[PDB]
Design a protein around this nucleic acid. Structure first.
Ligand SMILES: [Mg+2]
Ligand SMILES: [Mg+2]
Ligand SMILES: [Mg+2]
Ligand SMILES: [Mg+2]
Ligand SMILES: [Mg+2]
Ligand SMILES: [Mg+2]
Ligand SMILES: [Mg+2]
Ligand SMILES: [Mg+2]
Ligand SMILES: [Mg+2]
Ligand SMILES: [Mg+2]
Ligand SMILES: [Mg+2]
Ligand SMILES: [Mg+2]
Ligand SMILES: [Mg+2]
Ligand SMILES: [Mg+2]
Ligand SMILES: [Mg+2]
Ligand SMILES: [Mg+2]
Ligand SMILES: [Mg+2]
Ligand SMILES: [Mg+2]
Ligand SMILES: [Mg+2]
Ligand SMILES: [Mg+2]
Ligand SMILES: [Mg+2]
Ligand SMILES: [Mg+2]
Ligand SMILES: [Mg+2]
Ligand SMILES: [Mg+2]
Ligand SMILES: [Mg+2]
Ligand SMILES: [Mg+2]
Ligand SMILES: [Mg+2]
Ligand SMILES: [Mg+2]
Ligand SMILES: [Mg+2]
Ligand SMILES: [Mg+2]
Ligand SMILES: [Mg+2]
Ligand SMILES: [Mg+2]
Ligand SMILES: [Mg+2]
Ligand SMILES: [Mg+2]
Ligand SMILES: [Mg+2]
Ligand SMILES: [Mg+2]
Ligand SMILES: [Mg+2]
Ligand SMILES: [Mg+2]
Ligand SMILES: [Mg+2]
Ligand SMILES: [Mg+2]
Ligand SMILES: [Mg+2]
Ligand SMILES: [Mg+2]
Ligand SMILES: [Mg+2]
Ligand SMILES: [Mg+2]
Ligand SMILES: [Mg+2]
Ligand SMILES: [Mg+2]
Ligand SMILES: [Mg+2]
Ligand SMILES: [Mg+2]
Ligand SMILES: [Mg+2]
Ligand SMILES: [Mg+2]
Ligand SMILES: [Mg+2]
Ligand SMILES: [Mg+2]
Ligand SMILES: [Mg+2]
Ligand SMILES: [Mg+2]
Ligand SMILES: [Mg+2]
Ligand SMILES: [Mg+2]
Ligand SMILES: [Mg+2]
Ligand SMILES: [Mg+2]
Ligand SMILES: [Mg+2]
Ligand SMILES: [Mg+2]
Ligand SMILES: [Mg+2]
Ligand SMILES: [Mg+2]
Ligand SMILES: [Mg+2]
Ligand SMILES: [Mg+2]
Ligand SMILES: [Mg+2]
Ligand SMILES: [Mg+2]
Ligand SMILES: [Mg+2]
Ligand SMILES: [Mg+2]
Ligand SMILES: [Mg+2]
Ligand SMILES: [Mg+2]
Ligand SMILES: [Mg+2]
Ligand SMILES: [Mg+2]
Ligand SMILES: [Mg+2]
Ligand SMILES: [Mg+2]
Ligand SMILES: [Mg+2]
Ligand SMILES: [Mg+2]
Ligand SMILES: [Mg+2]
Ligand SMILES: [Mg+2]
Ligand SMILES: [Mg+2]
Ligand SMILES: [Mg+2]
Ligand SMILES: [Mg+2]
Ligand SMILES: [Mg+2]
Ligand SMILES: [Mg+2]
Ligand SMILES: [Mg+2]
Ligand SMILES: [Mg+2]
Ligand SMILES: [Mg+2]
Ligand SMILES: [Mg+2]
Ligand SMILES: [Mg+2]
Ligand SMILES: [Mg+2]
Ligand SMILES: [Mg+2]
Ligand SMILES: [Mg+2]
Ligand SMILES: [Mg+2]
Ligand SMILES: [Mg+2]
Ligand SMILES: [Mg+2]
Ligand SMILES: [Mg+2]
Ligand SMILES: [Mg+2]
Lengths: 86, 80, 199, 122, 21
RNA sequence: UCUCAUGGAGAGUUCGAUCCUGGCUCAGGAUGAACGCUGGCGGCAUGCUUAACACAUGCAAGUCGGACGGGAAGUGGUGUUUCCAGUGGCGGACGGGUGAGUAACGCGUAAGAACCUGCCCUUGGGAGGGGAACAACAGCUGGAAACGGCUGCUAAUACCCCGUAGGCUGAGAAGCAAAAGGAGGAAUCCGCCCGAGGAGGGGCUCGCGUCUGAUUAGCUAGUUGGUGAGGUAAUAGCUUACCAAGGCGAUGAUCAGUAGCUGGUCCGAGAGGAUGAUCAGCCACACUGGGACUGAGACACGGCCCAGACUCCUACGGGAGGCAGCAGUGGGGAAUUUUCCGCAAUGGGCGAAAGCCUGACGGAGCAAUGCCGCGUGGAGGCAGAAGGCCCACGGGUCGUGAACUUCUUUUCCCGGAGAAGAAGCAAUGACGGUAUCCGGGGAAUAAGCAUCGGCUAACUCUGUGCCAGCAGCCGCGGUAAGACAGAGGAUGCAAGCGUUAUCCGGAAUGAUUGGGCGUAAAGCGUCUGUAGGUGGCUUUUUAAGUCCGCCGUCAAAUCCCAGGGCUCAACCCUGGACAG
């Protein structure tokens, strides 16, 4: 299905990162939407990602008692690069 | 293995069967993969849906005696 | 499960009930004590409406209730649909074709297997009749005798246009579904419905 | 009120509290009478009420009312008790079903007999 | 002598021998 | 005046009255219900909720002589044919029961990649040459029994070796590995070994949804990751050594308490509340705990081993056992059935088939437990009599009610005939001589239970006198009681009617739809501010929400709509779909 975009809280450990994913959900009774935030242990060989980064999260075979997820370069994002002003 | 057989429904003394494709180790009325035919002795109502039967027989489904003979009368074994 | 009690009584209290009795009530002779309840609570009015219905057709309450659920299910005007349902009953169509003296008589007839619906014997009163249906007497001596003497000696020709009758074999025929104006009694169905809002 | 607050679960229901705890979710319970005695009712109702203390199968001891007129009940009798509250007497939440086990039916009651456990007279 | 437990006994013994193998 | 709607009711009670806030109580539905009184019949269902507490007896898993050697019944004999322990083969991992444990990827839903797979299909190649044992049996012997001990003996589709192998290990070089015959006179059949697929059944992994408690605030060190070696059918702290210091947590971790979950069921105008019996799927367990073995498959309910607790047998030296399988007994309890028939149907197991076994299942029996149908008579019946009760004694009312006269026979009784259910060769039916059909009698065999002060439909009289008693709330009852008990009368339902228990409703009384906070319960004493929530206008972008179309799926049964079948209905069957 659709992979999960999130941002990195902790880069400290080797070949791993700790990602925070925020997703919105329409709370079952009262119909307003709420932010629920979950953490993930993501497998990242090469240790390319640092703290603060915005990274897409992919699914794969289990690499540990926790990490099921492969750290993947951000899928698509609006360029923060300056655009023309017509 | 996969077996095409009768599953018993209706009520006391009045019996009506569905013809169904189901793994042989499930119970007699238990859950199944596909419903295919319909059968009944007293109203002498019998008819089937042949593409399904053929698609299961193709993948190796074994019928049971009663069912086997029902398929015989409707000539599903000749097309095979 | 049937009302074997005094008729004239329920007649006095409720009103005129065709399906019960052809004998007009006594002067009533209650003018001595002049005892009244005062007037009737709205509840009593509604209750007597329902009771009217129920006793005209010989139906039990718990039966009436499920008829009413059927009614609330059906798509259309509730009270009307109800009255349809009550008026298509077999002993009732039997009565209203004058094949019987009254509804208890017609019920007795139906019950003893003296009737045929499309060459098939139906002995249960509540059998629901559907359009294009043949109401016949069983071909035996006694059945014919009953139907003949109860048909001929009663002069009334009111037949309400959905009901056909033919002379020698005495083939009754149900033509169609009842019309609200063709109903067998004077009743505000609105009241019975309002009573049944609480079930 | 505030939605934000309602999503902290600020609505919780008040559970149903039973009127006859000693029954423990049953229609009846059998018990043995520890004592049979009389009590005076809360004023202005004065009379003398017939009550017996019963020790039950669920272990509790309660005080239950005996209906009708007259009774044969005495200590170490096995009766059957049912729910329902007598507004008169403080603390009495239970009756004694008449006509079963050790409580006989009320003698010479002709009407509404089923409540008091009485045969139909021939 | 007539001994009746097929399943029990027989499967037991078989299990032993096969286990040694 | 098109379309949508088939749906939301109140009443009493604080006061001398009123309006209000506010609780309590009632009218409705539903039971796996129990108890009281009463009880004719049929149709389809349902039947230990408590003690996952004990269990006497009988039965619930076997089959294959066409894998094999024997011996035992007959027969005249190895022409015929049966049974049978034993070795082997598959099956006992399905079916059946129960809900103790489990707040978990256990369940529902949706995804994934590192796997396994006997039987069943589809397909590519093969089955050479030997040898050795072990039961059985025999003899000797120990045992009360259970069950054993020595020495011989023997067959195989049972064991071992060698040769060959489109597979396995490995960068390669190389290295390594298989077989089984039995039927038939032959054709041919059922098998065997190695690969490669298919379908079904299993193992894992992850997103989301998955009870109450803050008077439970820090928890976790193989714990959270990395490498190296091991291990698993496969990924993995699954294991172990070393390195690093993480992981989870005020959006509630950890700890405690409760609970099997889901299709669904009950209620609700709807939004949603409560619950998880029967019926269907999944999990978990098998006297209490722990192990493994066999095997495609188990850590195995009617298998093994141990410990423990408990029951039995013993000739006292030792053994035997596990109903939460079907019935059945004790016990607990308000409470829940026969130690029944049958493999004929469907479904399983084994077999070449004949066939055998199936307390799964099909049926019967018991019980108003529930839903549904029918009955207990129909038509006429001076308006005269007996009797109950009321009466201002005039009369009223039980009452067309009965008695009485005719008609009818569903049900009852006595006789007859008598299915489908059975599937294509006939045969073969537990139900059952039942369902149904024809005849003969004959109103004949069959009505109770609540209530009658208000809510709430239905009223008077005798008996009692703050007594006896009633009551769901308000409250009745101190001499004429519409509220107690009796009678008559009436009303409501009706083979049921009431009472108690449980749940939702009404309750807008925990309020999203749908409430409040000056004085009725309710604004922190007042600020500063962190997380958190919302946030002015204009243009562009993106498309996460949002919206529309199409696809996959959300099992069948249930609910909804449309037909069809049991005489109708309940129930069953087909087809289809809104929601979300
Ligand atoms: Mg046929
Ligand atoms: Mg009466
Ligand atoms: Mg309602
Ligand atoms: Mg609000
Ligand atoms: Mg309530
Ligand atoms: Mg006050
Ligand atoms: Mg007052
Ligand atoms: Mg209020
Ligand atoms: Mg009720
Ligand atoms: Mg009885
Ligand atoms: Mg239990
Ligand atoms: Mg035994
Ligand atoms: Mg047997
Ligand atoms: Mg043979
Ligand atoms: Mg044999
Ligand atoms: Mg063989
Ligand atoms: Mg021979
Ligand atoms: Mg043998
Ligand atoms: Mg032997
Ligand atoms: Mg099992
Ligand atoms: Mg099982
Ligand atoms: Mg069962
Ligand atoms: Mg539990
Ligand atoms: Mg816990
Ligand atoms: Mg999951
Ligand atoms: Mg989860
Ligand atoms: Mg799982
Ligand atoms: Mg095998
Ligand atoms: Mg070949
Ligand atoms: Mg060879
Ligand atoms: Mg070799
Ligand atoms: Mg071999
Ligand atoms: Mg031969
Ligand atoms: Mg030969
Ligand atoms: Mg293969
Ligand atoms: Mg739940
Ligand atoms: Mg370590
Ligand atoms: Mg509501
Ligand atoms: Mg159960
Ligand atoms: Mg089940
Ligand atoms: Mg297990
Ligand atoms: Mg036990
Ligand atoms: Mg164990
Ligand atoms: Mg193994
Ligand atoms: Mg087993
Ligand atoms: Mg075990
Ligand atoms: Mg057992
Ligand atoms: Mg032991
Ligand atoms: Mg033992
Ligand atoms: Mg043993
Ligand atoms: Mg049992
Ligand atoms: Mg007992
Ligand atoms: Mg007892
Ligand atoms: Mg019972
Ligand atoms: Mg069979
Ligand atoms: Mg069979
Ligand atoms: Mg076979
Ligand atoms: Mg038997
Ligand atoms: Mg059964
Ligand atoms: Mg009986
Ligand atoms: Mg019945
Ligand atoms: Mg009965
Ligand atoms: Mg009862
Ligand atoms: Mg009924
Ligand atoms: Mg009459
Ligand atoms: Mg007759
Ligand atoms: Mg009949
Ligand atoms: Mg035949
Ligand atoms: Mg007859
Ligand atoms: Mg009134
Ligand atoms: Mg009373
Ligand atoms: Mg009540
Ligand atoms: Mg007075
Ligand atoms: Mg006096
Ligand atoms: Mg008096
Ligand atoms: Mg007087
Ligand atoms: Mg009274
Ligand atoms: Mg009376
Ligand atoms: Mg009841
Ligand atoms: Mg509410
Ligand atoms: Mg409240
Ligand atoms: Mg308020
Ligand atoms: Mg004040
Ligand atoms: Mg205040
Ligand atoms: Mg202030
Ligand atoms: Mg203040
Ligand atoms: Mg303060
Ligand atoms: Mg501030
Ligand atoms: Mg801020
Ligand atoms: Mg913002
Ligand atoms: Mg804006
Ligand atoms: Mg469905
Ligand atoms: Mg329909
Ligand atoms: Mg029909
Ligand atoms: Mg359907
Ligand atoms: Mg959809």
């Amino acid at each position: 299905m659709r992979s999960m975009q999130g941002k990195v809280i902790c880069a400290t450990n080797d070949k791993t990162v700790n990602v925070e994913v925020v997703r919105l959900a329409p709370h079952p009774k009262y119909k307003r939407r709420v932010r629920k935030k979950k953490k993930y242990q993501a497998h990242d060989p090469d240790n390319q990602f640092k703290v603060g980064d915005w990274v897409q999260l992919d699914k794969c075979r289990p690499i540990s008692k926790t990490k099921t997820f492969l750290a993947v370069a951000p899928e698509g994002r609006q360029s923060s690069a300056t655009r023309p002003k017509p | 293995m996969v077996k095409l057989r009768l599953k018993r429904c209706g009520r006391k003394q009045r019996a009506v069967y569905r013809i169904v494709a189901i793994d042989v180790r499930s119970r007699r009325e238990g859950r199944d993969l596909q419903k295919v035919g319909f059968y009944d002795p007293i109203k002498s109502q019998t008819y089937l849906n042949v593409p399904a039967i053929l698609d299961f027989l193709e993948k190796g489904a074994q019928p049971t005696e009663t069912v086997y003979d029902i398929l015989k009368r409707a000539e599903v074994f000749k097309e095979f | 499960s049937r009302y074997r009690g005094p008729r004239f009584k329920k007649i006095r209290r409720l009103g005129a009930l065709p399906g019960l009795t052809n004998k007009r009530p006594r002067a009533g002779s209650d003018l001595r004590n002049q005892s009244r309840s005062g007037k009737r609570s709205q509840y009593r009015i509604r209750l007597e409406e329902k009771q009217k219905l129920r006793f005209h057709y010989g139906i039990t309450e718990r039966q009436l209730l499920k008829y009413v659920r059927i009614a609330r299910k059906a798509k259309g005007s509730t009270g009307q649909v109800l009255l349809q349902l009550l008026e298509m009953r077999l002993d009732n169509i039997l009565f209203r074709l004058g094949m019987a003296p009254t509804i208890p008589g017609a019920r007795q007839l139906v019950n003893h297997r003296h009737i045929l619906v499309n060459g098939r014997i139906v002995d249960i009163p509540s059998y629901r009749c559907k359009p294009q249906d043949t109401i016949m007497a069983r071909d035996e001596q006694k059945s014919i005798a009953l139907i003949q003497n109860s048909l001929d000696l009663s002069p009334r020709e009111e037949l309400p246009k959905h009901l056909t009758l033919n002379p020698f074999p005495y083939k009754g025929l149900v033509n169609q579904i009842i019309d609200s104006k063709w109903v067998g009694l004077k009743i505000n169905e609105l009241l019975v419905v309002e009573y049944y809002s609480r079930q | 009120p505030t939605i934000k607050q309602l999503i902290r679960n600020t609505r919780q229901p008040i559970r149903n509290v039973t009127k006859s705890p000693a029954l423990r979710g049953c229609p009846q319970r059998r018990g043995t009478c520890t004592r049979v005695y009389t009590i005076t009712p809360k004023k202005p109702n004065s009379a003398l009420r017939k009550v017996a203390r019963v020790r039950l199968t669920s272990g509790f001891e309660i005080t239950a009312y005996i209906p009708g007129i007259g009774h044969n009940l005495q200590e170490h009798s096995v009766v059957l008790v049912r729910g329902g509250r007598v507004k008169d007497l403080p603390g009495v939440r239970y009756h004694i079903v008449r006509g079963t086990l050790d409580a006989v039916g009320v003698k010479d009651r002709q009407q509404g007999r089923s409540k008091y456990g009485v045969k139909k007279p021939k | 002598t007539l001994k009746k437990a097929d399943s029990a006994a027989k499967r037991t013994r078989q299990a032993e021998t096969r286990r040694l193998r």
